[PDB]
Structure 1
């Protein structure tokens, strides 16, 4: 983030893909021990590429949660997440994109 609002846009994207309020999503920083071998933030394509990587990661999360959603349709995002955790389903994933 250098003022262009990249993190803001990524939160907006993650919120739309996950179908939950932005209030439940947060981006703290950029670090080499979380996402390695990153290209420099430049060429105006950050929203383009990271937005896609965030989208994919979000899709993987939704897939892992689906069984629990279908199992409890009227529940909340919180219920599904806790159910998945207790059913020992990973709630962590990577996302990647290539133009």
Structure 2
């Protein structure tokens, strides 16, 4: 949708996997940096513990990625 990702190129030229793949990878990294301090504080915890603890510490769990 145009209101989640603006100004996108058409899904064309066989490159969608290459390029949207990189953009998704970069947004993932950003989320990983954000969750890191929480992973370190509680390394035996689950994904869900880290996410909640991030949310409760007012860390944003939303990001764009671009390539």
CA RMSD of aligned residues (A): 0.1
Mapping of residues 14-93 of structure 1, within 5 Å: 31-93=1-63
- Offset at 1:54? 0.1
- Offset at 1:36? 0.2
Distance in 2 of aligned mates of 1:33 and 1:52: 20
Superposed CA deviations along residues 60-92 of structure 1, whole A, max 9, x for unmatched, are 000000000000000000000000000000000
Distance in 2 of aligned mates of 1:51 and 1:71: 30
Distance in 2 of aligned mates of 1:35 and 1:59: 18
Tell me, which stretches of 5 or more residues in structure 1 are unaligned? Answer: 1-30
Superposed CA deviations along residues 20-75 of structure 1, whole A, max 9, x for unmatched, are xxxxxxxxxxx000000000000000000000000000000000000000000000
Tell me, which stretches of 5 or more residues in structure 2 are unaligned? Answer: none
Structure of greater relative contact order (alpha carbons < 8 Å, 6+ residues apart): 2
Aligned residues: 67
